Amino acid sequence: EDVVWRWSCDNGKCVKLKNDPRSSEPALSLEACKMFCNEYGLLWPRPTGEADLGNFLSKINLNSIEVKILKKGATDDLMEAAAKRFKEQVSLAIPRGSTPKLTGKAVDVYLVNENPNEKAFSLEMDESYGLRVSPSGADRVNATITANSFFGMRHGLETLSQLFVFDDIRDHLLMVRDVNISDKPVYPYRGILLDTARNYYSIESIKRTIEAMAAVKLNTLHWHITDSQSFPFVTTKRPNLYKFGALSPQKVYTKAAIREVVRFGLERGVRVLPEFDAPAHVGEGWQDTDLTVCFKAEPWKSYCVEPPCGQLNPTKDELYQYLEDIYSDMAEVFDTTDIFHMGGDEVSEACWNSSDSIQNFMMQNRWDLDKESFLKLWNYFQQKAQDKAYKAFGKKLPLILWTSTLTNYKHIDDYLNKDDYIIQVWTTGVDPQIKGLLEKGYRLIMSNYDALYFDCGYGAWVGAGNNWCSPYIGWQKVYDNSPAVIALEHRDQVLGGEAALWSEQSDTSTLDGRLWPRAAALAERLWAEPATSWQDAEYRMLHIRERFVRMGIQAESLQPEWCYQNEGYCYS
Ligand SMILES: COc1ccc2cc3[n+](cc2c1OCCC[n+]1cccc2ccccc21)CCc1cc2c(cc1-3)OCO2
Ligand SMILES: *[C@@H]1O[C@H](CO)[C@@H](O)[C@H](O)[C@H]1NC(C)=O
Numbered sequence: 037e038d039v040v041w042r043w044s045c046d047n048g049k050c051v052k053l054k055n056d057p058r059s060s061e062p063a064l065s066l067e068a069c070k071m072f073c074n075e076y077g078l079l080w081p082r083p084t085g086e087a088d089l090g091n092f093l094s095k096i097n098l099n100s101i102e103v104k105i106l107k108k109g110a111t112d113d114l115m116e117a118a119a120k121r122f123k124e125q126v127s128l129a130i131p132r133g134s135t136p137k138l139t140g141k142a143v144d145v146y147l148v149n150e151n152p153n154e155k156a157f158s159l160e161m162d163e164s165y166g167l168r169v170s171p172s173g174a175d176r177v178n179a180t181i182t183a184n185s186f187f188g189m190r191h192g193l194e195t196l197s198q199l200f201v202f203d204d205i206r207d208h209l210l211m212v213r214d215v216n217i218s219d220k221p222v223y224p225y226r227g228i229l230l231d232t233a234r235n236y237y238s239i240e241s242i243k244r245t246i247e248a249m250a251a252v253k254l255n256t257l258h259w260h261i262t263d264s265q266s267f268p269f270v271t272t273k274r275p276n277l278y279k280f281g282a283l284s285p286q287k288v289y290t291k292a293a294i295r296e297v298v299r300f301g302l303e304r305g306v307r308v309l310p311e312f313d314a315p316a317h318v319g320e321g322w323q324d325t326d327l328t329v330c331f332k333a334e335p336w337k338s339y340c341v342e343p344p345c346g347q348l349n350p351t352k353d354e355l356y357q358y359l360e361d362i363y364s365d366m367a368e369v370f371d372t373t374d375i376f377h378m379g380g381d382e383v384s385e386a387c388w389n390s391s392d393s394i395q396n397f398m399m400q401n402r403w404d405l406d407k408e409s410f411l412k413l414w415n416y417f418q419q420k421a422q423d424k425a426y427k428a429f430g431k432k433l434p435l436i437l438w439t440s441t442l443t444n445y446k447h448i449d450d451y452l453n454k455d456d457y458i459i460q461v462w463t464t465g466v467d468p469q470i471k472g473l474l475e476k477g478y479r480l481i482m483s484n485y486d487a488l489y490f491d492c493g494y495g496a497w498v499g500a501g502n503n504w505c506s507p508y509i510g511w512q513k514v515y516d517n518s519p520a521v522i523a524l525e526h527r528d529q530v531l532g533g534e535a536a537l538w539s540e541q542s543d544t545s546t547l548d549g550r551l552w553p554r555a556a557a558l559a560e561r562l563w564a565e566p567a568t569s570w571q572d573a574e575y576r577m578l579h580i581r582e583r584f585v586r587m588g589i590q591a592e593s594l595q596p597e598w599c600y601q602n603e604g605y606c607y608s
């Protein structure tokens with residue numbers, strides 16, 4: 037039936053009041069009130085530069101929006117696809133089952149791509165844009181997006197679509213009348229790590245994830261595509277790896293499917309970054325090669341962090357022929373990435389020390405069997421693996437490794453160097469390793485497990501209780517986790533951050549709820565690095581959750597919808 041309430045801005049809060057008929061004041065719908073009661077309206081993330089939204093809305097004819105590309109170039113196909121997606125972006129303002137009256141002004145969207153040939157991902161790419169909205173004549177709106185590249189331009193299309201509101205009191209589609217926005221991200225690497233080896237994720241759910249990432253301007257999908265539990269990556273050159281390693285014949289990622297995901301990501305400004313974790317985190321798929329040790333070793337607690345155990349045997353020269361083929365097959369289909377993630381997760385010495393051939397190998401080279409020697413074996417592996425990666429990608433390119441024994445800042449320079457290796461950080465923001473790494477010039481990606489491990493909090497998956505990194509991390513905590521605070525003067529060496537969805541307790545069915553809307557908190561933290569805390573983003577965070585749901589994302593619920601309609605009454 038008919039909406040009964042209206043909202044009125046009062047000290048930054050939209051107050052619900054009855055829509056009394058005996059009033060000469062025009063009623064405000066909830067989101068129309070929110071657009072101007074809130075400092076940044078309904079925007080997420082909030083812009084970093086100019087953020088002038090004016091004071092008025094204009095009624096818009098949904099069928100009279102037209103996008104015009106003013107500069108043509110190599111990104112013509114990308115710009116056209118982004119333009120065609122803009123109307124459905126706009127329709128996200130309308131609740132499902134509601135239809136706007138097809139009246140109001142016409143909208144002209146002018147896209148100005150000032151370097152229309154640029155379309156490569158790089159840490160130095162220009163994601164900035166300018167957004168202007170103003171009345172054009174009497175019956176039209178002029179929205180002009182100006183950006184130095186396609187990626188900044190499609191960010192601006194995202195922000196523009198957030199400047200529409202549905203008046204459900206009147207069934208009118210509205211748009212902010214006078215807008216001056218300039219915007220650019222604080223960090224170039226704004227990512228989500230998706231583990232698709234501890235459990236399988238449908239390609240459809242991966243594309244859905246990329247959709248939601250683009251909606252909040254995240255730009256990197258780190259595809260943790262192999263691990264001990266499964267090998268779903270279809271490597272044409274070593275087919276037994278996925279044939280033996282896959283959980284099932286249908287639970288694989290073919291070349292065609294990965295190409296689909298990579299293209300889907302490029303069109304939305306998302307770099308699809310593959311990882312082959314090595315030399316630990318291997319197992320399924322390597323049967324009958326004699327290239328691993330400790331696979332399914334028992335008791336697993338004595339040999340690895342979680343079952344099944346298993347590590348590569350770096351003393352077998354055939355291993356690096358396998359690795360070169362894997363990396364080459366990855367480079368063929370992951371052909372938008374400028375970076376390669378090589379894992380580097382903590383190696384088990386007990387696993388390597390229990391091997392006949394490994395100990396004989398270490399005798400012959402004057403190595404003992406102490407802790408320092410197995411670190412030397414790990415360095416031996418990473419050097420040879422790194423060479424195959426360069427040959428596979430046909431060029432030197434940045435490589436990522438996790439913080440580990442190998443990348444301890446006290447000895448990381450022994451074989452790594454800060455120009456070839458980026459370090460992904462799981463330690464807490466107060467761990468001394470971060471300061472030690474930054475002073476040695478290393479670049480960092482923050483994935484602090486106390487704020488950015490999105491798998492924490494659920495039940496145990498071995499034994500009873502809860503999983504290892506519980507409690508569950510609320511969005512308030514991931515919002516307040518600031519890399520700038522963590523890095524201090526070395527801020528420029530922080531490339532950004534990444535929410536990690538490890539998947540021993542997550543798959544296709546839980547993907548939406550694990551990531552959303554919590555990854556939006558990381559999106560604003562990395563895009564804007566606000567000096568304000570989560571309380572000042574709370575109202576806009578509640579709205580972006582609703583926008584995710586309108587997109588079809590099964591996003592987690594944060595608060596009673598009553599709180600969303602009654603700002604200021606839910607606090608502590
Ligand atoms: C790549 O980083 C990773 C990735 C995966 C990790 C997985 C597990 N564990 C640390 C991990 C880690 O390191 C995170 C640092 C953990 N950690 C360091 C220092 C102090 C701590 C105090 C309290 C809790 C954890 C503290 C901890 C044991 C553990 C037991 C399990 C399990 C998983 C883990 O599944 C079945 O049983
Ligand atoms: C649209 O607005 C932009 C920014 O103010 C302006 O540069 C451009 O000339 C306008 N175009 C039209 C057709 O009004």
Ligand SMILES: *[C@@H]1O[C@H](CO)[C@@H](O)[C@H](O)[C@H]1NC(C)=O
Nearest residue numbers: 385386389390405406407410
């Ligand atoms: C490796 O095993 C040998 C016995 O085979 C033992 O002497 C040595 O201390 C072990 N080293 C480590 C690091 O466990």
